[PDB]
Scaffold this active site. Sequence first.
Site, PDB file in Angstrom:
ATOM      1  N   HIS E   5       0.764  -1.241   0.000  1.00 54.47           N
ATOM      2  CA  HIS E   5       0.000   0.000   0.000  1.00 54.47           C
ATOM      3  C   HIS E   5       0.795   1.290   0.000  1.00 54.47           C
ATOM      4  O   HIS E   5       0.766   2.040  -0.976  1.00 54.47           O
ATOM      5  CB  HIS E   5      -0.967   0.022   1.174  1.00 54.47           C
ATOM      6  CG  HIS E   5      -2.257  -0.679   0.902  1.00 54.47           C
ATOM      7  ND1 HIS E   5      -2.415  -2.039   1.069  1.00 54.47           N
ATOM      8  CD2 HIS E   5      -3.446  -0.209   0.457  1.00 54.47           C
ATOM      9  CE1 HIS E   5      -3.650  -2.375   0.739  1.00 54.47           C
ATOM     10  NE2 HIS E   5      -4.297  -1.284   0.365  1.00 54.47           N
ATOM     11  N   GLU E  77       1.408  -0.952   7.907  1.00 57.06           N
ATOM     12  CA  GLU E  77       2.502  -1.028   6.958  1.00 57.06           C
ATOM     13  C   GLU E  77       3.668  -0.107   7.312  1.00 57.06           C
ATOM     14  O   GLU E  77       4.802  -0.311   6.858  1.00 57.06           O
ATOM     15  CB  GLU E  77       1.958  -0.768   5.555  1.00 57.06           C
ATOM     16  CG  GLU E  77       0.981  -1.855   5.106  1.00 57.06           C
ATOM     17  CD  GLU E  77       0.561  -1.718   3.659  1.00 57.06           C
ATOM     18  OE1 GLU E  77       1.443  -1.778   2.783  1.00 57.06           O
ATOM     19  OE2 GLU E  77      -0.647  -1.555   3.389  1.00 57.06           O
ATOM     20  N   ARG E 165     -25.783  15.475  12.970  1.00 59.36           N
ATOM     21  CA  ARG E 165     -25.992  16.342  11.821  1.00 59.36           C
ATOM     22  C   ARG E 165     -27.376  16.103  11.222  1.00 59.36           C
ATOM     23  O   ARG E 165     -27.538  15.352  10.255  1.00 59.36           O
ATOM     24  CB  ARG E 165     -24.900  16.122  10.761  1.00 59.36           C
ATOM     25  CG  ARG E 165     -23.591  16.872  11.028  1.00 59.36           C
ATOM     26  CD  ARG E 165     -22.574  16.634   9.914  1.00 59.36           C
ATOM     27  NE  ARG E 165     -21.332  17.395  10.060  1.00 59.36           N
ATOM     28  CZ  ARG E 165     -21.235  18.714   9.917  1.00 59.36           C
ATOM     29  NH1 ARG E 165     -22.312  19.432   9.622  1.00 59.36           N
ATOM     30  NH2 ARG E 165     -20.060  19.316  10.068  1.00 59.36           N
ATOM     31  N   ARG E 220     -18.137  24.455  16.155  1.00 60.07           N
ATOM     32  CA  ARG E 220     -19.415  23.825  15.824  1.00 60.07           C
ATOM     33  C   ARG E 220     -20.458  23.909  16.930  1.00 60.07           C
ATOM     34  O   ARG E 220     -21.648  24.086  16.658  1.00 60.07           O
ATOM     35  CB  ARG E 220     -19.192  22.358  15.447  1.00 60.07           C
ATOM     36  CG  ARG E 220     -18.459  21.536  16.499  1.00 60.07           C
ATOM     37  CD  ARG E 220     -18.639  20.061  16.216  1.00 60.07           C
ATOM     38  NE  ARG E 220     -18.311  19.749  14.830  1.00 60.07           N
ATOM     39  CZ  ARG E 220     -18.789  18.702  14.167  1.00 60.07           C
ATOM     40  NH1 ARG E 220     -19.619  17.859  14.764  1.00 60.07           N
ATOM     41  NH2 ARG E 220     -18.440  18.501  12.904  1.00 60.07           N
TER      42      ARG E 220
END
Lengths: 250, 250, 250, 250, 250, 250
Positions: E5, E77, E165, E220
């Site tokens: 990856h 990885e 939300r 927020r």
Amino acid sequence: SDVFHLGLTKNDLQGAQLAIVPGDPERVEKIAALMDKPVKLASHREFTSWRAELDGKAVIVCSTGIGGPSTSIAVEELAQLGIRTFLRIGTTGAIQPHINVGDVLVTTASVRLDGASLHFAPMEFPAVADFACTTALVEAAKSIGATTHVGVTASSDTFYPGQERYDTYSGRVVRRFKGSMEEWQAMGVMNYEMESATLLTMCASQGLRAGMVAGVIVNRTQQEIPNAETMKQTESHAVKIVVEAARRLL
Amino acid sequence: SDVFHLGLTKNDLQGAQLAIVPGDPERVEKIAALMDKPVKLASHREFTSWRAELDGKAVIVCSTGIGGPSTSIAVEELAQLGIRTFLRIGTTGAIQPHINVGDVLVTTASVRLDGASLHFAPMEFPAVADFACTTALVEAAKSIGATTHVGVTASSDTFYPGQERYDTYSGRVVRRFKGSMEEWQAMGVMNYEMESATLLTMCASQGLRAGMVAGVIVNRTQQEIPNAETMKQTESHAVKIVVEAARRLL
Amino acid sequence: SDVFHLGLTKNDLQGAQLAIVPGDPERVEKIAALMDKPVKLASHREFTSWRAELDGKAVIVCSTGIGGPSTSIAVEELAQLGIRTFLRIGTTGAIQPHINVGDVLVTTASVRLDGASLHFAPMEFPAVADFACTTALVEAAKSIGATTHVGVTASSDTFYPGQERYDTYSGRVVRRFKGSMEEWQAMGVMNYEMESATLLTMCASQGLRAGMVAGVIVNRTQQEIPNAETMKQTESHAVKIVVEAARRLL
Amino acid sequence: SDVFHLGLTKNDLQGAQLAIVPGDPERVEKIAALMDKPVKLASHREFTSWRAELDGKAVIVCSTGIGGPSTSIAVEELAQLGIRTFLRIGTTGAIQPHINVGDVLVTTASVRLDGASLHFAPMEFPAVADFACTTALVEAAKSIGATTHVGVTASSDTFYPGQERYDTYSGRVVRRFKGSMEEWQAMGVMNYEMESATLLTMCASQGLRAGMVAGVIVNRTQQEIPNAETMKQTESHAVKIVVEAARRLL
Amino acid sequence: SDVFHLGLTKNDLQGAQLAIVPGDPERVEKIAALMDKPVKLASHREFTSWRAELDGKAVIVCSTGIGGPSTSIAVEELAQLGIRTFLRIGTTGAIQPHINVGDVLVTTASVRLDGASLHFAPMEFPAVADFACTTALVEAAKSIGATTHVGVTASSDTFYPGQERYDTYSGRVVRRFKGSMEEWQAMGVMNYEMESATLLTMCASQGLRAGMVAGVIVNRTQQEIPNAETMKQTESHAVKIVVEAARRLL
Amino acid sequence: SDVFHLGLTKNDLQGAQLAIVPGDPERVEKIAALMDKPVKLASHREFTSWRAELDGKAVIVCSTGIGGPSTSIAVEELAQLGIRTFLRIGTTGAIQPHINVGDVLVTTASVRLDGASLHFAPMEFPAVADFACTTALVEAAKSIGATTHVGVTASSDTFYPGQERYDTYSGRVVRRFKGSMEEWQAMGVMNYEMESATLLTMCASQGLRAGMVAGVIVNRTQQEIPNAETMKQTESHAVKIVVEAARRLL
């Protein structure tokens, strides 16, 4: 446990070599706070102490608690461990009309009125502040905007009966004293503390660097009474000052 | 709160007019445990205030802190509140050889090796104990069985230089003190301490009775020290005598 | 007079905010025995409440019991009075092969194997040690020599199966905890205990300080037998550490 | 010496195989004395073990402590020594109007609202009492002349967070425990306690007989004031029942 | 070229064993641009990676991609290659009305509301963070005085169809997220993010150290959303932090 | 200026109501190339949109990005953009010893090893695909004459343990999955991809159709050294297919 009173081993300084030393444990944590890694180091009689980091360096914050004798111990105690530069700190009341509340005084030398200093050197020898340790302060105060001041402080062995005053139970001062605030006020003396002479003298006479930085929190010879907040904040202007200066002194 | 440090109302003593006064505040609770039904009046900073009944009499304990200035603050305010008699108890070293670890020493007068007492009296006036207080203390001691010695003590304003100590950082004794202990050690003077100088003088000269008992933690001319438990001998022998004493003078 | 299960009132605490907590009530008498002002308060259920003073401040050592259903009681019973910090100390077995008997083990968060905690928060939420009390413990534990490790712990609602133990009546473990210990070892968990899940989980979710330390009284993977005092002394470290960490939070 | 937590030596029960396990030791005592030769054995943590006898056969009485985890050990530790038939007895309040503050209930099975049962058998598994143990009981109460009740019991792991109560340092009532009590009733539940779903469960799923009987000191289902005359009465009757019950069971 | 990856190879690390893993591929630049001799190494899917040099050693940095599933690949990885210590840095919004748009938070552990973190340890194991890493980040934020904050972060697997939300296509979430901000809020949660959980959870339970730090871009909570000059400092602060930190952790 | 992560408006997609989303952006180019008028439209994080046409009707591609939380994002916005049908080509690994490397799989429904879908519908609800979108795939797969294989997949939130890969850094795979591949293998599942879940479940619970097809890039259980030339063409057909597949669904 290598020195007494303090109750600290040479391994408790993590290799440190300098101590800021106020005279009250309520400032120790406050001071140590303004830095990083304040792992409370100990508290053993009246010598409550911490330990912090500054510019990745070791710097301690230990107190003194009224009395040059009291003080003479902690510093020597410390000094025998590793420290070798005792930046001091504190607030105060000045004896000059031109000096304001918000200004900060940096003591160059001191009137040896204490009695303790007489155990490290005769009186003809001066209670002189280290040069570098003085400039380092003035700088640190030259940079935040604090009306800096420089001169001499009287270091007497007494609060009420000693410091020339006439408010207590009885109503006098020891003969040779009666009326001493006035005279000094005529020699350019700024403030009235109670540990400097011992410090300066016991460092100056023993090849050890020390400096002093106070903070005018009230001026007795003036109408206007100080203010809570002014005092609260001002107290911190003195905190920063030294904290910030010590870095260069490392 | 009528004082400035002890933080106690004159009504807090509930009678009290005497007071055992040790330097270390830690012992304040240790001491006040012996009396009857004790209580912690308060305890701001190095000024621990405990009270305790003794023979239905409201007695009091309070710390002195280290040094003569710190002392001056306590006593002055304590006297302000309502006390007229003090009784100090402590630890110390004995210079004479014939003296032993875990013994009691009483003091009738002290050599003035400070600069705090000078604020209340000229160096001619003497640091003298009080008969009344010397009476009990000496009797109460011979009463509980303790190798008792009685005489003169030197109240140094410093722990290291004034009491001539080379086992320090620099290893130097200002001309003045170079040889003082060895000289003392012949004038008969028995031991070294730090608060007697200011306690005796100021009291002796203010219409306030006072005396002072203590125990030997170490004989320095000696080398084979005491032992932890020997350290608790004073924490009972000397501790009981001062209360044993407190009683008689009630 | 104040609560029920304890029998203490907002006057037995002398106004406090912190408190220790050994599940076993026969350890309370030893915690305080290490602190000035050590006094016994009561002996209800298993909540053997005791009080003390550390650095002139009020500290309320108290006990919980086996499990988090009782600890449920203890914690709030105390806090409701006025405590906002708790530091559990205890006994524990180590699953990791390299952790020895004695080695003090601090925790960051315990794996939720209890039930009580589920009453104060979802299983998704983490039973996390307050950064404040976790640092303190690690310093103290470290500034004393204590062989410490800091990591993950497993809080079981049972002592035999929920912690894989076959030396029993039956000798079987229900599917769930079957082979779990094994996985925990791989997963790198440190030890087994029974109270931290609730405590931790509980305080976090309610806005309360909470930290935890314990002592290796047993390891399985290994061979060696239980020594002598290192099953009472193995605690000594933790016991002290939870105390040297006590000071720091006051 | 034979069993870690309890101390008990297999030679201390002498072939007994029953054991009334109450909440606190105070109850462990009023029980022992009704049988024969009640001898004390040991008392650790919340575990106090007495030894009685009934009609020439040995019997054990041991306190278990609060919570399902606490009990977790009492049992297995006993059941490890020789015991095979356990009986629980305590006191609780009711939730069904048709029950007075003087009745006695019996638990055939309990709603598992705990956490230590899952350490013994999946939630699919029933927390039901044995048939013999639960027969001896239903008989013993009819005998003495009581008003028995045989049904199901709510075995919560905490108090308010799972019983519809509130006032305290408000400890979140898990979203799962919303509309609980009212639904427990509609499903024919008698009382509410805290260790039965854990006792009955570890038994049946292992090969042991346990039973449960308790008196009702309160019945919050009504505001009708509760008389302590009943409280002490209800107690004794209940204990009589079990101790009488056990007679058969031996 | 080594890992299916990332792309990098054992060689392309130069012994480095610590990597800062920001989400975005840009930030990576912002970071790396701070150590010595920055050098891009690979750019494949959402995994771009450079190599740096700090206080003398080699280091890595690497974008993770949205959500923990993406993180899961990188982390592994990377560690496979040699990276043993990690360090995440990102942005977010507050839940508490006291958190400000200029503050920064360190996460002790997070309320596991994701799903991928479940392929490492059971839902019991906590989303706790390595003690040192966590400390390393509180110092840094300090070593430069920031409106810091420390505690638990909330992290689910969705943006609008989850993290409270009520704004998208459906206007709500399943019966799990339906007025939860208010919930976790009451429990003391600092923020909402997505990769945190997974990270901490995966790591603690494998034998690697990981720290979580972020900055509040949007408040927020409040009726808020900031501009383009503050959405830059937020990063300068966070970047200097996790970098200053990483220095120490090196 | 319409939706962030994607960055597209409405006039932007010429009506396009169906769209192809192949995880990796680097593969968006070589798909749009197969249909008509291939016009690029954006490039943000991985969400690389590309406009193209077929039979006079609009079709768009928009790589989603690894993990469900990613896709979640993309889909949720394309849908707001007008889209209402989604085809998801991508690669995968089969777990059957009869499916070769290059085969082409078509998913009816998959296992829910994700965690995002739980926000879209209960776990009970199935993670299945539209039927029109399933016959569309298959037939066209028959069309180019490609070796097809209809069935079911397993959608994992994590790529290494989710799909029992032991060759990791810890060589460890949690309980829930230890031996999780034979349970599936035997059960009759054919592949292991990472986005099939959220897609289907998310779409099949709002009204949008959806599909899933993938080429075998690696057969786990298999070995037989994969013939070099076969691996690209492997992905080739499965692309041709979807393009063509998309043909009938317009």
